[PDB]
Design a protein around this ligand. Structure first.
Ligand code: NAG
Ligand code: NAG
Ligand code: NAG
Lengths: 13, 191, 182, 190, 179, 15
């Protein structure tokens, strides 16, 4: 019902 | 007083909307200080390095087949979703302009003056402000601030007209704005 | 040409350990999450009745943003940000009218990093009565803007300054506003 | 008008620390505002900043003679040109003009802004202080900061918020490397 | 850091405009007039103490142009995005009636480096004694430019710096008049 | 003048 936050991957260490 | 170096990471998940939600463009953007280094553009369909700093992330992320299928669906699961949630108080938000007209200087007629049209409190930003003298549009001697975003979901703009006010004259400021069904006009009779 | 853009803008800053998470529609803040209190903060009170956000999802984004900062800091060979001092402007919300409450807006624009001390001065003295502010709003050039607000009643007896401290500035910047009787 | 535009920039930069004791040379190439390849004296070869720069980084780093020349630029170019310009850039000193006026014609016991305008000076480092009956005023000072006029002069306006009384003398004191001693300008309250 | 010298060049298509200049701490030492093939000192005095062979500049600009046509094609004909200017008008010095003075029009943070600037007194173009800088480089790779109008201050005159640039939907006037 | 500024040349681009 509410706003979704887009997640994001962790970088190449 | 601080002696120390700073490091900034930014991320911007953008949803760009065209003709309603008919066309949507999703852009996941990663920044180091102000430098974009890697992005996912839904028009492209995989991560691309914006700078060489970006390459290890773009290659590594582009190997993750579920990360791609998920980012590839974002136009729907994120962009179209969030549009539905906020549409009613963002897209549909409309607040009338308040229009004030005054001479910048108090003085007798037959002296150069600026006539100020202050247009305040309105939403959204698109507006047209025109000056008229005895019903004729003044296309020269108009000085505009352009659009000022106040940071509180309102805008303002000041549109000044250069003139030498004489006894007969009526000056009209006319405003057009999505909140208005017909143009809003305010008069100043040369005083 | 596009009608609308929604942006979920995030940052993390070392060594200050400052994070921010916010939604932005056509340049205006819908909400941010207060990282400390773990709560959704709506830019206008009204928005918290029109919609919801789970503050939780933001905390995790910021932790992955802190990790990525630390990867990018090394990748860049510890290349630091160059300070960009703010442009500061003080305007009214609306034209000054005797007996009409109004608002001074201090517009802080085109700066980085997103760290700033802002004080309102009335006749050289700090004011906090009724003051409010935004978090750091994103720009299309990946610099920041910020707004501070001071409700006032118009008076030829008062002068105001918005006093901005930023690392890009040699000195505190005072931007002046007064309403002249002339 | 209508047709689209393509823009190349090059910047040959020389950065000087403690005279010419440390110099950093950067050769920078831009397509629009996008930096795509550069040479950094601290690195000693060309690096692609973007995808578009890899061809030039590979073509130029393979040129032993180009690389040797770019690695000597801190000397043949940076220190050289600093040397050429030193007497009229680094050592340029231009005398300030100082003017004091109230921002507004006000009666006494009204608030005014006393403007100390400092004009036509070089270099940019300057000190502008306000005194009230020769006591320094530290609060209520409002400065534009440095304004670059584009003609190798600066100006700055340093204003004092005050409520002048009958009798009162205010002084603006300017210190600048062109001056052997401070310039002072007086304003007596009407 | 104590000082910075930058030899900044650009080439712009399809306008066939090139610039070559030196910048010391944000001020122009000189540029080369591509058309007259000559070194133009920002202050006369400079050309007394130093020289520049203008030919070196034409040669650099020829290579910059070849390099732009490679980059253009390499970019797949990615055009520049127009960034409209900020414009500020101020005086050289404090204004006094009938005391010769200069109006400065500072045009900032724009690209591409193409602009039309008109000084308007009472709505009408003036050019007696005007002058202007070439396009000066910024650390964000946008441009700066100064135009100048000598003037006699008067209660009857108002002035505007009128700036036309491709990123502005309409010409931008910045106003000045004597207070 | 006393001395000539050196113009730094640039290499030609990989065509
Ligand atoms: C804000 O204030 C604190 C302490 O008063 C100071 O140490 C800090 O650096 C200030 N921030 C800026 C950007 O000036
Ligand atoms: C400057 O003016 C000419 C017409 O006089 C026009 O063709 C050109 O496009 C203008 N340049 C701009 C708007 O930058
Ligand atoms: C600057 O400081 C260092 C300190 O070691 C000194 O050795 C150097 O010679 C100085 N500057 C010049 C112009 O030689």
């Amino acid at each position: 019902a509410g706003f979704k936050g887009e997640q994001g991957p962790k970088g190449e260490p | 007083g601080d002696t120390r170096p700073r490091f900034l990471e930014q991320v911007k998940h953008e949803c760009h909307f065209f003709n309603g939600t008919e066309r949507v463009r999703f852009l996941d953007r990663y920044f180091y200080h102000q430098e974009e280094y890697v992005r996912f553009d839904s028009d492209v369909g995989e991560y691309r390095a914006v700078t060489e700093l970006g390459r290890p992330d773009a290659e590594y992320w582009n190997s993750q087949k579920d990360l791609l299928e998920q980012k590839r669906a974002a136009v729907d699961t994120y962009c179209r979703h969030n549009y539905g949630v906020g549409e009613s108080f963002t897209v549909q938000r409309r607040v009338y302009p308040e229009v004030t007209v005054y001479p910048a200087k108090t003085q007798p007629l037959q002296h150069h003056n600026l006539l100020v049209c202050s247009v305040n409190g309105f939403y959204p930003g698109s507006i047209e402000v025109r000056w008229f003298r005895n019903g004729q549009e003044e296309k020269t001697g108009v000085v505009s601030t352009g659009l000022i975003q106040n940071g509180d979901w309102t805008f303002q703009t000041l549109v000044m007209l250069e003139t030498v006010p004489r006894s007969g004259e009526v000056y009209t400021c006319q405003v057009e704005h999505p909140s208005l069904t017909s143009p809003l006009t305010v008069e100043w009779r040369a005083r | 040409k596009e009608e609308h853009v929604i942006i979920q803008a995030e940052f993390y800053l070392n060594p200050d350990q400052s994070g921010e998470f916010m939604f932005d529609f056509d340049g205006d803040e819908i909400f941010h999450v207060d990282m400390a209190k773990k709560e959704t903060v709506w830019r206008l009170r009204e928005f918290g009745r029109f919609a919801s956000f789970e503050a939780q999802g933001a905390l995790a984004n910021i932790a992955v943003d802190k990790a990525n900062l630390e990867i990018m800091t090394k990748r860049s060979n510890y290349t630091p940000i160059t300070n960009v001092p703010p442009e500061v402007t003080v305007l009214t919300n609306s034209p000054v009218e005797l007996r009409e409450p109004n608002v001074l807006i201090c517009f802080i624009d085109k700066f980085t990093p997103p760290v700033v001390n802002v004080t309102w001065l009335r006749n050289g003295k700090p004011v906090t009565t009724g003051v409010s502010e935004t978090v750091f709003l994103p720009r299309e050039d990946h610099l920041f803007r910020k707004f501070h607000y001071l409700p006032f009643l118009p008076s030829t007896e008062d002068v105001y300054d918005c006093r901005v401290e930023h690392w890009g500035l040699d000195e505190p910047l005072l931007k002046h506003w007064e309403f002249d009787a002339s």
